[PDB]
Write an enzyme that holds these catalytic residues in place. Sequence first.
Site, PDB file in Angstrom:
ATOM      1  N   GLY A  48       0.812  -1.203   0.000  1.00 57.55           N
ATOM      2  CA  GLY A  48       0.000   0.000   0.000  1.00 57.55           C
ATOM      3  C   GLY A  48       0.847   1.256   0.000  1.00 57.55           C
ATOM      4  N   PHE A  67       2.492   3.113   2.641  1.00 51.24           N
ATOM      5  CA  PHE A  67       3.754   3.175   3.384  1.00 51.24           C
ATOM      6  C   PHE A  67       4.267   1.832   3.905  1.00 51.24           C
ATOM      7  CE2 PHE A  67       0.733   3.827   6.897  1.00 51.24           C
ATOM      8  CZ  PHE A  67       1.298   3.112   7.941  1.00 51.24           C
ATOM      9  N   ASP A 126     -10.381   7.233   9.244  1.00 52.52           N
ATOM     10  CA  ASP A 126     -10.220   6.647   7.916  1.00 52.52           C
ATOM     11  C   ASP A 126     -11.170   5.462   7.721  1.00 52.52           C
ATOM     12  OD1 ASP A 126      -9.233   6.435   5.352  1.00 52.52           O
ATOM     13  OD2 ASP A 126      -7.327   5.512   5.936  1.00 52.52           O
ATOM     14  N   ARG A 132     -12.675  -0.148   2.081  1.00 51.30           N
ATOM     15  CA  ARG A 132     -11.327  -0.647   1.828  1.00 51.30           C
ATOM     16  C   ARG A 132     -10.576  -0.868   3.144  1.00 51.30           C
ATOM     17  NH1 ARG A 132     -11.153   5.044   1.342  1.00 51.30           N
ATOM     18  NH2 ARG A 132      -9.626   5.750   2.891  1.00 51.30           N
ATOM     19  N   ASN A 133     -11.061  -0.264   4.229  1.00 48.25           N
ATOM     20  CA  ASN A 133     -10.422  -0.418   5.535  1.00 48.25           C
ATOM     21  C   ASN A 133     -11.174  -1.330   6.494  1.00 48.25           C
ATOM     22  OD1 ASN A 133      -8.163   1.097   4.903  1.00 48.25           O
ATOM     23  ND2 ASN A 133      -9.019   3.022   5.684  1.00 48.25           N
ATOM     24  N   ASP A 153      -6.681  -0.754   9.624  1.00 46.74           N
ATOM     25  CA  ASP A 153      -5.991   0.445   9.145  1.00 46.74           C
ATOM     26  C   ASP A 153      -6.097   1.589  10.148  1.00 46.74           C
ATOM     27  OD1 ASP A 153      -4.833   2.565   7.753  1.00 46.74           O
ATOM     28  OD2 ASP A 153      -5.750   2.032   5.832  1.00 46.74           O
TER      29      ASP A 153
HETATM   30  N1  LIG Z   1      -4.746  -8.234   8.704  1.00 44.63           N
HETATM   31  C1  LIG Z   1      -4.856  -8.448   7.274  1.00 44.63           C
HETATM   32  N2  LIG Z   1      -5.287  -9.631   6.796  1.00 44.63           N
HETATM   33  C2  LIG Z   1      -5.400  -9.848   5.460  1.00 44.63           C
HETATM   34  N3  LIG Z   1      -5.075  -8.858   4.576  1.00 44.63           N
HETATM   35  C3  LIG Z   1      -4.636  -7.643   5.008  1.00 44.63           C
HETATM   36  C4  LIG Z   1      -4.512  -7.414   6.397  1.00 44.63           C
HETATM   37  N4  LIG Z   1      -4.071  -6.171   6.561  1.00 44.63           N
HETATM   38  C5  LIG Z   1      -3.906  -5.608   5.367  1.00 44.63           C
HETATM   39  N5  LIG Z   1      -4.241  -6.469   4.393  1.00 44.63           N
HETATM   40  C6  LIG Z   1      -4.192  -6.232   3.013  1.00 44.63           C
HETATM   41  O1  LIG Z   1      -2.822  -5.789   2.639  1.00 44.63           O
HETATM   42  C7  LIG Z   1      -3.016  -4.603   1.777  1.00 44.63           C
HETATM   43  C8  LIG Z   1      -2.287  -3.437   2.329  1.00 44.63           C
HETATM   44  O2  LIG Z   1      -3.060  -2.695   3.248  1.00 44.63           O
HETATM   45  P1  LIG Z   1      -2.420  -1.395   3.965  1.00 44.63           P
HETATM   46  O3  LIG Z   1      -3.326  -0.936   5.079  1.00 44.63           O
HETATM   47  O4  LIG Z   1      -1.086  -1.766   4.583  1.00 44.63           O
HETATM   48  O5  LIG Z   1      -2.187  -0.231   2.903  1.00 44.63           O
HETATM   49  P2  LIG Z   1      -3.285   0.863   2.517  1.00 44.63           P
HETATM   50  O6  LIG Z   1      -3.988   1.345   3.753  1.00 44.63           O
HETATM   51  O7  LIG Z   1      -2.578   2.093   1.853  1.00 44.63           O
HETATM   52  C9  LIG Z   1      -4.518   0.187   1.322  1.00 44.63           C
HETATM   53  P3  LIG Z   1      -6.184   0.784   1.839  1.00 44.63           P
HETATM   54  O8  LIG Z   1      -6.174   2.341   2.044  1.00 44.63           O
HETATM   55  O9  LIG Z   1      -7.269   0.413   0.779  1.00 44.63           O
HETATM   56  O10 LIG Z   1      -6.503   0.118   3.143  1.00 44.63           O
HETATM   57  C10 LIG Z   1      -4.450  -4.376   1.642  1.00 44.63           C
HETATM   58  O11 LIG Z   1      -4.886  -4.772   0.339  1.00 44.63           O
HETATM   59  C11 LIG Z   1      -5.105  -5.171   2.630  1.00 44.63           C
HETATM   60  O12 LIG Z   1      -6.319  -5.710   2.078  1.00 44.63           O
END
Ligand SMILES: Nc1ncnc2c1ncn2[C@@H]1O[C@H](COP(=O)(O)OP(=O)(O)CP(=O)(O)O)[C@@H](O)[C@H]1O
Length: 279
Positions: A24, A26, A145, A149-150, A163
């Site tokens: 994603g 960071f 947030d 997506r979160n 998130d």
């Molecule tokens: N605990 C978990 N279990 C399964 N998948 C996860 C997870 N945490 C994060 N992901 C997945 O890993 C990816 C990265 O998420 P991350 O929160 O680190 O970046 P990001 O916030 O910029 C994407 P977004 O804004 O859509 O959430 C996401 O596609 C998420 O679906």
Amino acid sequence: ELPEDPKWEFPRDKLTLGKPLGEGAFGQVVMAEAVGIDKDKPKEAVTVAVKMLKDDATEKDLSDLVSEMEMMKMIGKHKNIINLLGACTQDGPLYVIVEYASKGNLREYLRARRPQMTFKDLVSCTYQLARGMEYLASQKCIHRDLAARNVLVTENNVMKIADFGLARDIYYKNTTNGRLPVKWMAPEALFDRVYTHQSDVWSFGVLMWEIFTLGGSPYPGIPVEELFKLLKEGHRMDKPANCTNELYMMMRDCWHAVPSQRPTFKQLVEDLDRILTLT
Ligand SMILES: Nc1ncnc2c1ncn2[C@@H]1O[C@H](COP(=O)(O)OP(=O)(O)CP(=O)(O)O)[C@@H](O)[C@H]1O
């Protein structure tokens, strides 16, 4: 450079990294197996998710990942939020270990079940998320947030708020040149740079809209640059096709211009409990 915290530390030799789940803004998240991370079962291997820095990580990414880890520490445990399980912070790269959700994020989960989802499923989903947020607000945590997506979906289809990178412990004074997604933000947060639990309530209304449109993108066709003005003028989204009047009135109430006039998460839980109990 990271200070010790024994309550949360987890040994690196009990952590086996596996398939990448997605990168994603960071960081990167990978599936992994953790042995004995459930202290009441020290010999069991449990599938978990690990958040770490990428190779192109900035200094800000590192402090953000730490800050996110620290928020999740003080938040507490709940069925409807991705919970912190442990961390590897010493003698190596920072690993933030959290509960694993096998079905990914709610937005993609809903989009891939477009014609499969029943109406009651959507109401259940909304109810669960209201509960996570009720708990979250009771811990004096503003998410800032909240969005589809979160939200992450487990194998047994439990909704989990995730998130926590923008989450804060509390009014709160947002910075100018905001880092909050515009289409999910309450006017106070955007215009007055202030944030309360009632600000999350607005975001929840947008979340409701995402859910009942099976993962639609809010304010469709309206560029972010024009959205600021429209909200001032009272613009609101239409009722999704697959939504009752009762649930639509709930969204519109979350979108009240006056924060105190919006329902609280406790109220939303009450109403959603009732609506679910029927249906
Ligand atoms: N605990 C978990 N279990 C399964 N998948 C996860 C997870 N945490 C994060 N992901 C997945 O890993 C990816 C990265 O998420 P991350 O929160 O680190 O970046 P990001 O916030 O910029 C994407 P977004 O804004 O859509 O959430 C996401 O596609 C998420 O679906």
